Design a protein around this nucleic acid. Sequence first.
RNA 1: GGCUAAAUACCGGCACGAGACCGAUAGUCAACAAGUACCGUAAGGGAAAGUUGAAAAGAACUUUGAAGAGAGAGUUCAAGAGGGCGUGAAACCGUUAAGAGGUAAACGGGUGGGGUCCGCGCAGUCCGCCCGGAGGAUUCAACCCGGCGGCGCGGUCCGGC
Lengths: 187, 124, 50, 181, 53
Amino acid sequence: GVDIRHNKDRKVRRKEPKSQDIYLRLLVKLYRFLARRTNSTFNQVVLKRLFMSRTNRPPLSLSRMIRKMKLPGRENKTAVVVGTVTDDVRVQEVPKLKVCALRVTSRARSRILKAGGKILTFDQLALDSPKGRGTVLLSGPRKGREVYRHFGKAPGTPHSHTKPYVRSKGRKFERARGRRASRGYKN
Amino acid sequence: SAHLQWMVVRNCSSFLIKRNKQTYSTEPNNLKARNSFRYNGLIHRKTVGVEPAADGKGVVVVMKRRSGQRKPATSYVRTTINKNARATLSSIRHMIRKNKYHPDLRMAAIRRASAILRSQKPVM
Amino acid sequence: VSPKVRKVLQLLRLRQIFNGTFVKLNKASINMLRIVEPYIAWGYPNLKSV
Amino acid sequence: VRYSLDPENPTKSCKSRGSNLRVHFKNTRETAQAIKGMHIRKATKYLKDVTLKKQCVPFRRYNGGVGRCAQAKQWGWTQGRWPKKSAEFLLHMLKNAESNAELKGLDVDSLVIEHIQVNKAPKMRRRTYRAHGRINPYMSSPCHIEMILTEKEQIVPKPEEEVAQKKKISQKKLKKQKLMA
Amino acid sequence: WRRWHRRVNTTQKRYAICSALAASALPALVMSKGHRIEEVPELPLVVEDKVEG
RNA sequence: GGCUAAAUACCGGCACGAGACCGAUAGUCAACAAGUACCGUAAGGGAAAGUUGAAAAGAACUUUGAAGAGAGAGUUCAAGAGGGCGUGAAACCGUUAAGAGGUAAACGGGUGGGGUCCGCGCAGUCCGCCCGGAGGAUUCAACCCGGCGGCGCGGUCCGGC
Ligand SMILES: [Mg+2]
Ligand SMILES: [Mg+2]
Ligand SMILES: [Mg+2]
Ligand SMILES: [Mg+2]
Ligand SMILES: [Mg+2]
Ligand SMILES: [Mg+2]
Ligand SMILES: [Mg+2]
Ligand SMILES: [Mg+2]
Ligand SMILES: [Mg+2]
Ligand SMILES: [Mg+2]
Ligand SMILES: [Mg+2]
Ligand SMILES: [Mg+2]
Ligand SMILES: [Mg+2]
Ligand SMILES: [Mg+2]
Ligand SMILES: [Mg+2]
Ligand SMILES: [Mg+2]
Ligand SMILES: [Mg+2]
Ligand SMILES: [Mg+2]
Ligand SMILES: [Mg+2]
Ligand SMILES: [Mg+2]
């Protein structure tokens, strides 16, 4: 007998996409090869994000892509997101962008192209940037989901700003006892 | 494309047989009856098929032409070879190597031709 | 195996019976070997042993 | 009509059987085992003695509670009884088998009981009244019986005192025969 | 009152009609569906409008 | 004080259509002389129960028996389907055959002996090339005519979409 624990032997991590999409799996075949046969860590990161689930691939808005592609030294670099590029109506002017994405919404496509930009697919990124050179890999906000408002210390604990689960919002819905000192206590 | 068409049929095809822990493919121009991307006889632009002649004499070597990829009626060119055993294999070897028409199917085509000709000998 | 012996035997890498390792001796290590005294046979190997 | 066995030489055998016969299966199974292998004249004589309590049928398997008798020592056994209905029912079947041999032209004086088998038949439902307003089963246990007789090389004539007897006439048979005619 | 019926989004239903039509113009997929189209002159097969009458 | 169609409801009734339903211990209690038989003074309670065969051709006739039952014979593709008869399981029973038997039987592992059957075994594989002996030919290469196919950075040919 060997003195060892086995509860952590199996690592919980995706080796492939749960999706049965045949176009996504053709891109995984592509980047499985590039990640294996090139020393480029960029390929490994993209291969990993192709396995990732829907909530681990948040959409990247147009306004946020412009901000991150406007930092100094990022001129003529292709912005890359393994996800969806959504349009942002709060933007007034779109610059000339070169972007690679899994999906670009219909209105984001017109605005990027109308500014003189180029929209790639990941099979076109490989031919243009086999090792990922001259790229800017970008991610959407992962905690930008309604669930993360409900996580943390339970709402009924001191200095807990977690959001409760209420069927309705209003004066009659979880506001008397425990939420104001006038009714029992507050914390 | 071939790769896209293989994602549709790799596990869903009227030509797919799964049985006895084995998988085969019954479509024409598959040289090994194998459910495989290489040996599939429908999804590639260029394919090689070896079949016996209508009479039990000789083999028919089928080659897919380049042009009519969406025209099944004129897509395949058939050639009947009814020579001696060693001469038949040479023609198949030349039809593949010299044309560089799927050189990866050269020995599979040659092995299938030797199996058809052998089956056409008198049964002892 | 008691918790303190179990940790010290894991640091020596002796997780199995009749496993062996070299241990360079000094105050820190000699006192570890004293905790695991019932669970180990040790001593000084000669050149032939190495 | 299928018998559990097949005769070795069908041209030298005769058959008899009956179904749903209202004789006890247990008593009749023991009786049949007694005459198995016997010559017909020996078997016929033996069963008549059982009727007269001069020879016993040894009860070997279904012997729970059965009593002891001196005549059971002839069989290397202690328990024996004299089932009269089993003997009479089997005598009738032997008479039928003997007639079937005649109809086939066999030598009735050489026949041996080669195969005999008693099978339980479907049971018949009556009832008995018990204490405290309870009713319980009162079942008959009938049986199917089948025998095969075969010619062998031993010859035993029919007893003289048995062949000298009158051919009994039955009026009730005549009445029905005349009505049918 | 088992829920026998299912709602499918219109965009996805139209997506499904588009994939079916795209896959109907490829000989390999139509052959792999069991159809004997080894001698049909072309795919897609378009015939004159007389046939409507 | 008053009337008022329509759009709405409908496990009763008359008449219909359908089903990713059940398939005779299921599905209605009820596939059948079922709200029947049967129980209860009554209010009430309430079953079991489908299938020979293509066609009754449903076994004439002979013979033993008082008869039930049998033996022959015959019908049928089959009664190895015989009127509660399609198939015909298990438990349980009879008989036949084989083996065995004083620590209830049964059981795991390891062998050994004997059977039943299988190899549709019993002078022992098949294949490539090469050497040699005997033969025999819709006879090889090389050239000529024609057809088809592949490729061409035809270093930069013409015409097409
Ligand atoms: Mg272990
Ligand atoms: Mg464990
Ligand atoms: Mg675990
Ligand atoms: Mg007792
Ligand atoms: Mg008593
Ligand atoms: Mg009473
Ligand atoms: Mg009114
Ligand atoms: Mg029933
Ligand atoms: Mg019912
Ligand atoms: Mg039943
Ligand atoms: Mg059933
Ligand atoms: Mg019933
Ligand atoms: Mg039935
Ligand atoms: Mg039959
Ligand atoms: Mg039948
Ligand atoms: Mg029928
Ligand atoms: Mg039945
Ligand atoms: Mg039956
Ligand atoms: Mg038995
Ligand atoms: Mg025995």
